[PDB]
Amino acid sequence: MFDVFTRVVSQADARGEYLSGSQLDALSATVAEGNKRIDSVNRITGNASAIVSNAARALFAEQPQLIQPGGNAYTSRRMAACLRDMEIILRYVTYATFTGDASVLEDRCLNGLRETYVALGVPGASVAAGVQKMKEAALDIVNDPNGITRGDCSAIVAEIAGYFDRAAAAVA
Amino acid sequence: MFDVFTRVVSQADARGEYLSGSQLDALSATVAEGNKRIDSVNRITGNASAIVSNAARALFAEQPQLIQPGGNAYTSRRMAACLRDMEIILRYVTYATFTGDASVLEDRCLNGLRETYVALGVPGASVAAGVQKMKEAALDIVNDPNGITRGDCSAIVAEIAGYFDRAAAAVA
Amino acid sequence: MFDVFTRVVSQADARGEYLSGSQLDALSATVAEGNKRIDSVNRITGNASAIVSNAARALFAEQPQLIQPGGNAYTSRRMAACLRDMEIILRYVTYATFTGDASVLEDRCLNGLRETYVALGVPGASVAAGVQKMKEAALDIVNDPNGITRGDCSAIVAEIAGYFDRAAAAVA
Amino acid sequence: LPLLNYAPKSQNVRVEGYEIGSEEKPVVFTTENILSSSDMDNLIEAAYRQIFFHAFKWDREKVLESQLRNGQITVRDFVRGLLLSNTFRNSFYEKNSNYRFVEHCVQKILGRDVYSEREKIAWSIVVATKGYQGLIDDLLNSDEYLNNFGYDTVPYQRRRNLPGREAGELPFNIKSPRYDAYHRRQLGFPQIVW
Amino acid sequence: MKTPLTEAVSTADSQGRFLSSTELQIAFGRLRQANAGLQAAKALTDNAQSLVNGAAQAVYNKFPYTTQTQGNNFAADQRGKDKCARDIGYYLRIVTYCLVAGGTGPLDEYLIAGIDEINRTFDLSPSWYVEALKYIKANHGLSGDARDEANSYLDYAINALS
Amino acid sequence: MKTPLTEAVSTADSQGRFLSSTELQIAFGRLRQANAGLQAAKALTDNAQSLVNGAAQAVYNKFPYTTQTQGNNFAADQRGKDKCARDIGYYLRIVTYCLVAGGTGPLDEYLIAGIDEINRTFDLSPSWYVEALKYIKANHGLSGDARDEANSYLDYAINALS
Amino acid sequence: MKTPLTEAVSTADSQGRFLSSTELQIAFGRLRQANAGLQAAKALTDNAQSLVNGAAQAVYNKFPYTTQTQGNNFAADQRGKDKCARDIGYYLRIVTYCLVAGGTGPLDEYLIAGIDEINRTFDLSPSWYVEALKYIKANHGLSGDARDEANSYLDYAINALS
Amino acid sequence: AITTAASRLGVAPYNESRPVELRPDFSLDDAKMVIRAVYRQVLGNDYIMDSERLKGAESLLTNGSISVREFVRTVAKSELYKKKFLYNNFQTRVIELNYKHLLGRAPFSEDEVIFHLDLYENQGFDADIDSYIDSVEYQENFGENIVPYYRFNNQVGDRTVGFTRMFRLYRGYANSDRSQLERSSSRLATELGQNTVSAIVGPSGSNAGWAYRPSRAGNTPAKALGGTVPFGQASKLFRVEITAISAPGYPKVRRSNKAVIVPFEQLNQTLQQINRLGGKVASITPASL
Numbered sequence A, B, C: 001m002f003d004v005f006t007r008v009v010s011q012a013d014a015r016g017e018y019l020s021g022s023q024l025d026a027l028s029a030t031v032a033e034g035n036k037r038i039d040s041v042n043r044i045t046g047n048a049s050a051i052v053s054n055a056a057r058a059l060f061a062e063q064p065q066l067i068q069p070g071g072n073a074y075t076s077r078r079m080a081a082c083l084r085d086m087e088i089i090l091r092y093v094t095y096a097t098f099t100g101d102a103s104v105l106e107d108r109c110l111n112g113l114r115e116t117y118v119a120l121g122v123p124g125a126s127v128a129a130g131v132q133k134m135k136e137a138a139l140d141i142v143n144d145p146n147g148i149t150r151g152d153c154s155a156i157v158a159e160i161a162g163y164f165d166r167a168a169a170a171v172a
Numbered sequence D: 001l002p003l004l005n006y007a008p009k010s011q012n013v014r015v016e017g018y019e020i021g022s023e024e025k026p027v028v029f030t031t032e033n034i035l036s037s038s039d040m041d042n043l044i045e046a047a048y049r050q051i052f053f054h055a056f057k058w059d060r061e062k063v064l065e066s067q068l069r070n071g072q073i074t075v076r077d078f079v080r081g082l083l084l085s086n087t088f089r090n091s092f093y094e095k096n097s098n099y100r101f102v103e104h105c106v107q108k109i110l111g112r113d114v115y116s117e118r119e120k121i122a123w124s125i126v127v128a129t130k131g132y133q134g135l136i137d138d139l140l141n142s143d144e145y146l147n148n149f150g151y152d153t154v155p156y157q158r159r160r161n162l163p164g165r166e167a168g169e170l171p172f173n174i175k176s177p178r179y180d181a182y183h184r185r186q187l188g189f190p191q192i193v194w
Numbered sequence E, F, G: 001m002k003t004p005l006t007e008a009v010s011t012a013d014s015q016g017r018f019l020s021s022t023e024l025q026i027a028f029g030r031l032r033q034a035n036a037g038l039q040a041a042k043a044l045t046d047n048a049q050s051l052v053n054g055a056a057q058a059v060y061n062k063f064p065y066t067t068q069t070q071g072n073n074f075a076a077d078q079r080g081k082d083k084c085a086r087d088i089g090y091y092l093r094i095v096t097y098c099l100v101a102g103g104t105g106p107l108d109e110y111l112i113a114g115i116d117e118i119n120r121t122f123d124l125s126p127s128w129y130v131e132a133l134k135y136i137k138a139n140h141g142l143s144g145d146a147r148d149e150a151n152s153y154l155d156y157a158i159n160a161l162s
Numbered sequence H: 001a002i003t004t005a006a007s008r009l010g011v012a013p014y015n016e017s018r019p020v021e022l023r024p025d026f027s028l029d030d031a032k033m034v035i036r037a038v039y040r041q042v043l044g045n046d047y048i049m050d051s052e053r054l055k056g057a058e059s060l061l062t063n064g065s066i067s068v069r070e071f072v073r074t075v076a077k078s079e080l081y082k083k084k085f086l087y088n089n090f091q092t093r094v095i096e097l098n099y100k101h102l103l104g105r106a107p108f109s110e111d112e113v114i115f116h117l118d119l120y121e122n123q124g125f126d127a128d129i130d131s132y133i134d135s136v137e138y139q140e141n142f143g144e145n146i147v148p149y150y151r152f153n154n155q156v157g158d159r160t161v162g163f164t165r166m167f168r169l170y171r172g173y174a175n176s177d178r179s180q181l182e183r184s185s186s187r188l189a190t191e192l193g194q195n196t197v198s199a200i201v202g203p204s205g206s207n208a209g210w211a212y213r214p215s216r217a218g219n220t221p222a223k224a225l226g227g228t229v230p231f232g233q234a235s236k237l238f239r240v241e242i243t244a245i246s247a248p249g250y251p252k253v254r255r256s257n258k259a260v261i262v263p264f265e266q267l268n269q270t271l272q273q274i275n276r277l278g279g280k281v282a283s284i285t286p287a288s289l
């Protein structure tokens, strides 16, 4: 996988040149925001169960046919598999937030997942809707100011939102 | 795989209601011929080697090109493979007769068999002819009146014939 | 495996009591020793090839019977295995130094190593002599005053020397 | 009857990779390291992910786990018990054809993709002739398995990621879910939304 | 799926042999039990609404907090009660499926597999469903083999839950 | 036992390589966190008994039926109250262990693995312990890195129970 | 590409777990090291040409036969000298990459992996590159964390070459 | 007795070796034979240099001033014995060596370790040696005039645990009790503490898998708890001890000694795999049924 530093390293090595001053300054600015990235990762991790469960309940309320008999979320095993999948997507989006680059999320979770859900009959659009609900809940947890040093976390929130809709597009 | 009961159960669970009175009556009807079903399975199992050997001999008699040098049944390994596939197809139709549902036969024996025969150069039509020969021998053996409490076995014979036809059509 | 903190934690859980103030202060003292420990690990790691090669050269100079034909270090594969064993023992000594506990060295490296050497005919006493030579070389490297903040690393050096002693007693 | 001869195919695992340990090197979960109970939990979960992708507690084999913890059985024996377990038979054998059961066996025991359709065809007859456990033991006693994972190491997808590349081959749990379109249409999916 | 017929063919297939006398005896046992199981399923189906209503009411009586405290996992509102009655209906319907099939297989594949995950994820206490199943035990009005088989499935669900 | 140092050594040992600058930075992060972890464990330990009794009282308040319902699994008698306070004390003590060790290792080793079987067989609602952990979060009175790490362990336990 | 961040994610993913406080401390250690790594990379970059030229001259001085004997693997002609300068520049550039990344990953997959077969196939003596790296160590003029980390990478390359 | 497996073990030379008795009015060869037998058996077949020989004790035994039992006591209390067996050994190893030399048998249980360790710590080494020699067991086996010898064969007050532990203490005829693989480590501490036994592995030249020794931890247990369930369908289970595993090389091979519980149906495959890994089979013991 690649992280935020290593992405720039890989482009520079492909071009076979040293990192320029501007690239090093950009990485220094990335280092400057590392605390916000770590605590956003921590906040999502500490609220993962609530995010997954609330998003799932909202999804089955908006799409009752998922949980009605014959639905893809009907029966306990299918319902638990769906919850697990929500949690897996959330965990890999936290990985991507932690590294600062989407390589782990694509390589380990997203790439080929659409074909997996096509092969299983899992409605990928409904998975995308679930991922959007997780995104909404997760952005609320990252953005709440209680019990934390106040600051501007808009850049990291935008990066997290980008990872989440990337997951939603990948499963659709 | 399913059995005569689990198939109705799976359909009802997919549509999410209880088995109707008519469905329960049909299943009670099916357990009324259960002794005849066990008799048919036992008779085919007790004469499996004879059925396979006689059907193979007749098939190579009317289709000499299979056993001519260069034919698909030529050489000991390929000929043993042909005898093996006949025995396996007969065994899985006995499984289907036992459970009362063709699912085992479909799932384990006929799923992908035609494509495999195409890839190997195995003539599927000749396999269909051989399993039709096994059908005539097995249905004669099931319908043998000697040594058994006489009764009407037309329904179970029709079910077994359907399994054998389904196995023939999977490769034909 | 265990590190310096988890050893105290495991003992405390076995007693079923909170860590005492003395134990917390001792762990704080260990924390204050952390930079010196990291420096020792880095210094042994940076000279690992020199340590292994010089110790092996000295060992085969003092014990020529190892490298004469018929000796255990004779032939290229047995010589390569010997050098590799020395590097592995050094590596696990650095693992124990890094964690502050000898559990990694005992469980992953020294468990069964004596029995392995006697089963293969590897002279364990000569392995202990080579480990001794790596010990003196590595302790001289750790105590090098050039190019490092001066301070007292005697406790770290004693701990590292203890790890080497364990390795040498175990292999002999 | 001897197995059909099938030609190999160019693969990363067939060729020397000069691998240096990194984030893409699969973690070696081995009992040779005298693992604590929590490290054994990690090793056991690695085996569950390799064999069942995910294991619900209905899918867990607590008796097998206790046996592996006590040293009664090796890691390879635990892998065999997972493959012979009810979860594996119901999810991967029952819901798939024999050919797509060889795949899900080559992929997660040997840690490599199948060479071709011919390999799938050749190994698919083994269940019906030598038995299910016959296939499991043939794959576990194979030179490929023993040379790669031995007795004490949990198998894994081998050489999935080449160095420097952003993405390697698809993980087998993504590439090959328990079932495919055959059992999908037997179930009645895909379902229309709204 | 766990059912006498499916396992007989499954165990014979997994070791690559023809059905023998042992699988025939398994089928004979299935034939002996089948009529009682079908009759039990019919009896449980006929007053399924009364059984489900009584079981849900029994859960509410033993656990009054479930009808009082507010929460998504509780039945204080009509939405919670509807979810609860639907869950009890699932339990009873799958029990009838097990009676028809002759084994705990419908419960295993439709309800038991990953029920633990459900209850933990949505904060549904398994003791609630245990009390519902004990009401179904005590009020199904079955006798003979029908009662014994049906109680075995209900106790199977209870043992999985508890 | 998950810690920054043991994980770094385990990663290096699996890769069969010497500890690099990556593992050195892992140790540096452990050093950066360790002091605040140690004073978090001290502060939690000094106020441990009061925190445990307050969490017990909070659980009894949110779930009143636990104090007036008969049964081995409830706290309607002194025996049950004692076992409840002991359980909450176990949670608190192992959280202090996690703060000392710098990871969830003590929780995984001593409490997380197998807690679901315990809560199922002894019919103990994980929501009670979740409420106890919420009270401990709300009342441990920590700040900064001590607060963050401690709340991470308590939330790890909450997520494990939910 | 071994770095602290990617290894923390690999450890968490290999256990199927979210990112706990252990991984967070790994990231904190990475943040502590990163500014020094970036300034070390900048210092090496600005002095790259002089360092490469001096390292090439040090290799030529210590091994004069390289500038005298003919052969594809030697620097007797301009072609060999350009190849040698290019190789030494490769080493310096990849070391700066490692300083940026925070691990040996750039060296591991851009340079270290397979370098043995490179040296054997083209009859390139690894002692040449060892002396070039030694010159870079002696003349990079770094101090503090910058030096320690850069020197760790340089000794990592030297250890891989010997 | 031990007949078929005597040569494979180190028992065959002791089968035709009669006990060395000093008769009343003995000749000088009888005295020298007693001296030679005592040196060989009490000092555990160590080479005895001329400078280390107890000249005075030999003279006294030759003269009849001391009995065979007294000469054995003098040898066991000598500085030579303490240098060879006491000063560099864990006292449990000292007890093992005492039982092997003075009584010709292995310790039976932890109670003997308790008694001898307490007696050494409270009254010294000489008193402990005296307890070995003034014991009822010594008197009934050797008495006053017979050199102690290895008691391989079954006797009246035996336990079979002692028969198994004898081959943990005795490692062949051309072996010297200070030249064994385990060196100075106690061979029976775990066994006596846990009241367990090890499969008997014979001496080097008669047994290819002679070098097998279990590690400190990560050892396969003796019995197959769980039966054949983890191995699918299986008839019987066997614990196989394998030594000298080297072919794949590190890291594929970590410990050269490995014990595996395998089904009967995989025994052929297990043997082939052992041959491939270059190993030697030390023992095979039924593990189930």
Ligand SMILES: *[C@@H](C)[C@H]1/C(=C/c2[nH]c(/C=C3N=C(/C=C4\NC(=O)C(CC)=C4C)C(C)=C\3CCC(=O)O)c(CCC(=O)O)c2C)NC(=O)[C@@H]1C
Residues within 6 Å of the ligand: A032, A033, A034, A035, A036, A037, A038, A039, A040, A042, A142, A143, A144, A145, A146, A148, A149, A150, A151, A152, A153, A156, F033, F144, F145, F146, F148, F149, F152, G021, G024, G025
């Ligand atoms: C946007 C995401 C929200 C936000 C974040 C924010 N955090 C900080 C500062 C810090 N956060 C931490 C985090 C931790 N300390 C620990 O020991 C652990 C446990 C493993 C964690 C997660 C740290 C160390 C700091 C620095 C010290 C401090 O307490 O300030 C900031 C301040 C700027 C900075 O980057 O340092 C900000 C902005 N704040 C908001 O307003 C958002 C809701």
Ligand SMILES: *[C@@H](C)[C@H]1/C(=C/c2[nH]c(/C=C3N=C(/C=C4\NC(=O)C(CC)=C4C)C(C)=C\3CCC(=O)O)c(CCC(=O)O)c2C)NC(=O)[C@@H]1C
Residues within 6 Å of the ligand: B032, B033, B034, B035, B036, B037, B038, B039, B040, B042, B142, B143, B144, B145, B148, B149, B150, B151, B152, B153, B156, E021, E024, E025
């Ligand atoms: C068509 C299949 C043929 C046929 C069958 C037939 N059989 C019965 C009745 C029984 N057959 C059995 C069978 C077995 N008993 C055993 O112990 C075993 C071996 C394990 C077997 C296979 C049994 C138990 C019965 C019931 C008792 C009885 O003998 O009557 C019938 C009678 C009706 C029924 O359904 O039971 C029939 C009709 N009869 C034919 O004419 C066909 C050629």
Ligand SMILES: *[C@H](C)[C@H]1/C(=C/c2[nH]c(/C=C3N=C(/C=C4\NC(=O)C(CC)=C4C)C(C)=C\3CCC(=O)O)c(CCC(=O)O)c2C)NC(=O)[C@@H]1C
Residues within 6 Å of the ligand: A066, A071, A072, A073, A077, A078, A079, A081, A082, A083, A085, A086, A088, A089, A108, A109, A110, A113, A116, A120, A122, A123, A126, A127, A130, D052, D053, D054, D171, D173, D174, D176, D177, D178, D179
């Ligand atoms: C939930 C929001 C939706 C849903 C989910 C659903 N998924 C499955 C089954 C599988 N999902 C996966 C997932 C992954 N494989 C990977 O390797 C990773 C990345 C690391 C992921 C995300 C797989 C492999 C399966 C099949 C195997 C298994 O489930 O154990 C199911 C059930 C399908 C079945 O019966 O097998 C379900 C229900 N379905 C919905 O209706 C929601 C919209």
Ligand SMILES: *[C@H](C)[C@H]1/C(=C/c2[nH]c(/C=C3N=C(/C=C4\NC(=O)C(CC)=C4C)C(C)=C\3CCC(=O)O)c(CCC(=O)O)c2C)NC(=O)[C@@H]1C
Residues within 6 Å of the ligand: B066, B071, B072, B073, B077, B078, B079, B081, B082, B083, B084, B085, B086, B088, B089, B108, B109, B110, B113, B116, B120, B122, B123, B126, B127, B130, D001, D002, D003, D004, D098, D099, D121, D122, D123, D124, D125, D128
């Ligand atoms: C005999 C009637 C005809 C015939 C057969 C034939 N088949 C093969 C080879 C294979 N047949 C199979 C069969 C199956 N796959 C399954 O999963 C199932 C259900 C359990 C079955 C029945 C397979 C997989 C193979 C290939 C593997 C193997 O043979 O071991 C051959 C051999 C072909 C070859 O050796 O190249 C033959 C000859 N051939 C005829 O001419 C008859 C008409």
Ligand SMILES: *[C@H](C)[C@H]1/C(=C/c2[nH]c(/C=C3N=C(/C=C4\NC(=O)C(CC)=C4C)C(C)=C\3CCC(=O)O)c(CCC(=O)O)c2C)NC(=O)[C@@H]1C
Residues within 6 Å of the ligand: C066, C071, C072, C073, C074, C077, C078, C079, C081, C082, C083, C085, C086, C088, C089, C108, C109, C110, C113, C116, C120, C122, C123, C126, C127, C130, H245, H246, H247, H248, H249, H250, H253, H254, H255, H256
């Ligand atoms: C070098 C100082 C001495 C020496 C060494 C030597 N060792 C071997 C063979 C092996 N060494 C090991 C090592 C280990 N196993 C572990 O698990 C650990 C800890 C992680 C270690 C250190 C093993 C397993 C073997 C066997 C397989 C292999 O060779 O890799 C040999 C070869 C013996 C032979 O003939 O096969 C040698 C020569 N020998 C000397 O003379 C030095 C004193």
Ligand SMILES: *[C@H](C)[C@H]1/C(=C/c2[nH]c(/C=C3N=C(/C=C4\NC(=O)C(CC)=C4C)C(C)=C\3CCC(=O)O)c(CCC(=O)O)c2C)NC(=O)[C@@H]1C
Residues within 6 Å of the ligand: C032, C033, C034, C035, C036, C038, C039, C040, C042, C142, C143, C144, C145, C148, C149, C150, C151, C152, C153, C156, F021, F024, F025, G033, G144, G145, G146, G148, G149, G152
């Ligand atoms: C002890 C064997 C020798 C010694 C050690 C020593 N080191 C320090 C201080 C530090 N060392 C480091 C280490 C690193 N910084 C990096 O970036 C890297 C690579 C990742 C390493 C290895 C650090 C960060 C410090 C603290 C800051 C500083 O530069 O001083 C000390 C001082 C006390 C302390 O513990 O910090 C000491 C004593 N000094 C000797 O004289 C011994 C030979």
Ligand SMILES: *[C@H](C)[C@H]1/C(=C/c2[nH]c(/C=C3N=C(/C=C4\NC(=O)C(CC)=C4C)C(C)=C\3CCC(=O)O)c(CCC(=O)O)c2C)NC(=O)[C@@H]1C
Residues within 6 Å of the ligand: D009, D010, D011, D012, D014, D015, D016, D017, D018, D162, D163, D165
């Ligand atoms: C050299 C003349 C050209 C070149 C080569 C190149 N190849 C690879 C990578 C691989 N090569 C193979 C090939 C095989 N695998 C097989 O099974 C067989 C038969 C035994 C062969 C020949 C494979 C599978 C790989 C990938 C696995 C691995 O590299 O370890 C590379 C590396 C690509 C990368 O991204 O690392 C290269 C560079 N490249 C050129 O520019 C030359 C024209």
Ligand SMILES: *[C@H](C)[C@H]1/C(=C/c2[nH]c(/C=C3N=C(/C=C4\NC(=O)C(CC)=C4C)C(C)=C\3CCC(=O)O)c(CCC(=O)O)c2C)NC(=O)[C@@H]1C
Residues within 6 Å of the ligand: A057, A060, A067, A073, A074, A075, A076, A079, E059, E060, E063, E066, E067, E072, E073, E074, E075, E076, E079, E080, E081, E083, E084, E085, E087, E088, E090, E091, E110, E111, E118, E122, E124, E128, E129, E132
């Ligand atoms: C009734 C005894 C108690 C109760 C019930 C209640 N249940 C839910 C939610 C769900 N119930 C299930 C269970 C199943 N689904 C299946 O398909 C099957 C197997 C065939 C079972 C057993 C599931 C999966 C859910 C969640 C999904 C859904 O929205 O239905 C709720 C709502 C929980 C929530 O957060 O929305 C409730 C209220 N509540 C009580 O108070 C009773 C004591």
Ligand SMILES: *[C@H](C)[C@H]1/C(=C/c2[nH]c(/C=C3N=C(/C=C4\NC(=O)C(CC)=C4C)C(C)=C\3CCC(=O)O)c(CCC(=O)O)c2C)NC(=O)[C@@H]1C
Residues within 6 Å of the ligand: F059, F060, F063, F066, F067, F072, F073, F074, F075, F076, F079, F080, F081, F083, F084, F085, F087, F088, F090, F091, F110, F111, F115, F118, F122, F124, F128, F129, F132
């Ligand atoms: C308190 C929040 C509620 C409560 C408590 C209660 N607990 C039990 C019984 C047990 N609690 C445990 C838990 C642990 N043991 C451990 O070792 C650890 C990990 C370190 C934990 C978390 C266990 C194992 C038991 C059962 C055995 C035992 O008694 O120790 C009971 C009694 C249950 C019974 O007697 O069957 C009770 C009452 N009760 C309430 O009402 C509170 C809301």
Ligand SMILES: *[C@H](C)[C@H]1/C(=C/c2[nH]c(/C=C3N=C(/C=C4\NC(=O)C(CC)=C4C)C(C)=C\3CCC(=O)O)c(CCC(=O)O)c2C)NC(=O)[C@@H]1C
Residues within 6 Å of the ligand: G059, G060, G063, G066, G067, G072, G073, G074, G075, G076, G079, G080, G081, G083, G084, G085, G087, G088, G090, G091, G110, G111, G118, G122, G124, G128, G129, G132
């Ligand atoms: C300089 C220290 C000595 C020297 C150099 C020399 N090198 C080569 C050839 C090659 N060098 C490399 C090395 C790399 N390529 C890479 O991509 C990287 C990693 C990023 C490295 C380190 C390679 C692969 C070659 C061969 C292919 C090529 O020509 O590029 C030569 C020429 C050898 C030949 O046969 O042409 C020379 C001369 N020569 C000296 O005398 C110095 C002491």
Ligand SMILES: *[C@H](C)[C@H]1/C(=C/c2[nH]c(/C=C3N=C(/C=C4\NC(=O)C(CC)=C4C)C(C)=C\3CCC(=O)O)c(CCC(=O)O)c2C)NC(=O)[C@@H]1C
Residues within 6 Å of the ligand: H045, H046, H047, H048, H173, H174, H175, H176, H179
């Ligand atoms: C000489 C060619 C090589 C050599 C030999 C050497 N051997 C020992 C020690 C012992 N040798 C034996 C062998 C026997 N004792 C017997 O009773 C019998 C016949 C049944 C044999 C074959 C024994 C048992 C020992 C140990 C007893 C003792 O007192 O040592 C040593 C001494 C080792 C040491 O003192 O540490 C030596 C030196 N050494 C060489 O270098 C030659 C190649």
Ligand SMILES: *[C@H](C)[C@H]1/C(=C/c2[nH]c(/C=C3N=C(/C=C4\NC(=O)C(CC)=C4C)C(C)=C\3CCC(=O)O)c(CCC(=O)O)c2C)NC(=O)[C@@H]1C
Residues within 6 Å of the ligand: H090, H091, H092, H113, H114, H117
């Ligand atoms: C006291 C602080 C702890 C403790 C002690 C304890 N030890 C034993 C038993 C034994 N201790 C030994 C020790 C030695 N053997 C030697 O050779 C040497 C000196 C050279 C030593 C130190 C041995 C061999 C035994 C076994 C014999 C015996 O039991 O006396 C016990 C008794 C164990 C039992 O169950 O019998 C005890 C109690 N126990 C604690 O709880 C303290 C922490």
Ligand SMILES: *[C@H](C)[C@H]1/C(=C/c2[nH]c(/C=C3N=C(/C=C4\NC(=O)C(CC)=C4C)C(C)=C\3CCC(=O)O)c(CCC(=O)O)c2C)NC(=O)[C@@H]1C
Residues within 6 Å of the ligand: H001, H002, H003, H004, H005, H006, H152, H153, H154, H155, H158, H159, H160, H163
């Ligand atoms: C007879 C039913 C079978 C049989 C027996 C047999 N046993 C031996 C030898 C020994 N038996 C023992 C057993 C014990 N020793 C004890 O001290 C105890 C009680 C505490 C027991 C149970 C031992 C240790 C031996 C060897 C020592 C000795 O015999 O003194 C033999 C002789 C083998 C040989 O001569 O090599 C035999 C024949 N053999 C059969 O075939 C019967 C099935």
